[PDB]
Amino acid sequence: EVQLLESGGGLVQPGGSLRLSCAASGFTFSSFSMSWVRQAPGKGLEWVSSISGSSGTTYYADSVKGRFTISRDNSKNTLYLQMNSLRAEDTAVYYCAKPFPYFDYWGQGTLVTVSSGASEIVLTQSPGTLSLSPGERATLSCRASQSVSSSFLAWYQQKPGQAPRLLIYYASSRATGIPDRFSGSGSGTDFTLTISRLEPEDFAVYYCQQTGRIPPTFGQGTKVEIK
Amino acid sequence: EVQLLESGGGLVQPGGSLRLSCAASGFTFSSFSMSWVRQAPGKGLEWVSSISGSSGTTYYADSVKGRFTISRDNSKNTLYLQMNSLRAEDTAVYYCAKPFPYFDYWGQGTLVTVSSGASEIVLTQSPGTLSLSPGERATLSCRASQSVSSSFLAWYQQKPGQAPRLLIYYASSRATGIPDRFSGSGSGTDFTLTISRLEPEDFAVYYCQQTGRIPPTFGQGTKVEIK
């Protein structure tokens, strides 16, 4: 049975040092790249560092380069991560994992807390490209990193070679000249622009925008292109 | 008829200065906040600066604060943007727009080019939260900022209070013990994780990951929660 067990986590001051260890068993340790992947509290996953089976190659994420050093002892089937110049940003549960760049096996993780003793809303849109035929239904998504009422989520269109134009101020309230086949829905974090039946002119790029706080940020855009 | 016409764009060296102008007509200029919004070549939209009808308030994006100064001449119905310490990052088509924080009317824009004479893949997932009942079909999306073959897009699951576990190495090739109701599709920029019929244990957070280049980045996660 494959087992990865982490050790050495705990509380450390900013600028301090900490060395993590991972004991591997149940497989030929030297035949696998080994990795460290971390998860900040309430956040997602970030690969940290990897090392090939023979230590011939090491890889690091840019944010830890020059401060972290990965190593392994094949005679004792143990993986190490020496962490120096620790910053509050490094606070996370650190998982030992196998192999690289995907991760087939995960340990349970060890918590590293770098302690002494808001923000702007990001909009992301999906999909990047919608490939549809005229007359088909188009469903475009917009995601807000923080809660936004439907009263503060707008939609824009930009035809190729033209300027952006407003489609929807908020909710499904359309600007002048915008036909009713465009409707907006959603409130909170996830929003939808529906084009019930695509017309030739509807093949364009679409942007969502939150207008509840300054700066009023735009999503990165969804291109609706003809099949 | 509302008209907004920009002027003053052109080529300028890094560190140089440029003043844009916008002539407004067809409406009572002094009754509207006026705005500048820019679009870098091949990029999305970024609000730059706004000014209330009486110039009592001005707003700026963090990236231009201290370098740009917005102003208006209500007697001549003209909006201005003085741009100092110009950086290559400021290269964009600059649009005059009305009002704030949404934009009802747009000019055609003027091009500002700050010239002397790659990158990491970002994954974004949608929606943020999927609220479904057991037995229903779940469709999760993942978007890559650059092209990725299906052979290098993996999917992970993280149940609450547990470590992440791999679901799919690439395409729809599942890890050991992962049932066939999880399938992966897509190749290029837009990917899908389908859970054909939700089981109670499937209510969790799901992450996509691209494994084609270093760093192997993760999406920000999609939470599938019970209705």
From TrEMBL, chains A, B:
Entry's localization field: Cell membrane; Secreted
Residues of the Ig-like domain: 1-96, 119-209
One Pfam family of this chain: V-set
Assigned GO CC terms: extracellular region; immunoglobulin complex; plasma membrane
UniProt KW keywords: Adaptive immunity, Cell membrane, Disulfide bond, Immunity, Immunoglobulin, Immunoglobulin domain, Membrane, Secreted, Signal
Example GO BP: adaptive immune response
Disulfide bonds: C22-C96, C142-C208
SUPFAM superfamilies the UniProt entry points to: Immunoglobulin
InterPro entries to which the protein is assigned, alphabetical: Ig-like_dom, Ig-like_dom_sf, Ig-like_fold, Ig_sub, Ig_V-set, IgHV
Source taxon at top rank: Eukaryota
Subunit structure comment from the entry: Immunoglobulins are composed of two identical heavy chains and two identical light chains; disulfide-linked.
Protein name per the record: Anti-(ED-B) scFV
Organism (species): Homo sapiens (Human)
